[PDB]
Design a protein around this nucleic acid. Sequence first.
DNA 1: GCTTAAAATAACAATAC
DNA 2: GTATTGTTATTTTAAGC
Length: 97
Amino acid sequence: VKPPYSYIALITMAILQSPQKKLTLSGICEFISNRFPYYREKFPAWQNSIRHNLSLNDCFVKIPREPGNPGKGNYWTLDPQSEDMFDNGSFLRRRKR
DNA sequence: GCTTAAAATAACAATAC
DNA sequence: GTATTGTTATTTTAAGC
């Protein structure tokens, strides 16, 4: 059902798409599932997968189980670094792996 | 044809409520 | 006690030499 793809890319865009300086792991899961149905169909653990490609890359700060996460109500905050490491490049989705 | 790197995936673990 | 997130580590895939 279609091959896999770079999540970091979708992530970088998920964060970039939000220049408001804010993001939510859950929100992303929705933004992705909303974008890709197949992904929301199989969802072979897009939790760690996303969160992985989400954190493992940008290297930002997130908020764990807070007093305002009834189900999937969390908050993720990223510093002005992701857009920095990106702007520098030119949307390289590999970088001579 | 082989190895190396990075990307992608999965499982657990820790905190918080 | 339960629920949500976070962190780590392992795996797999694909491209680099």
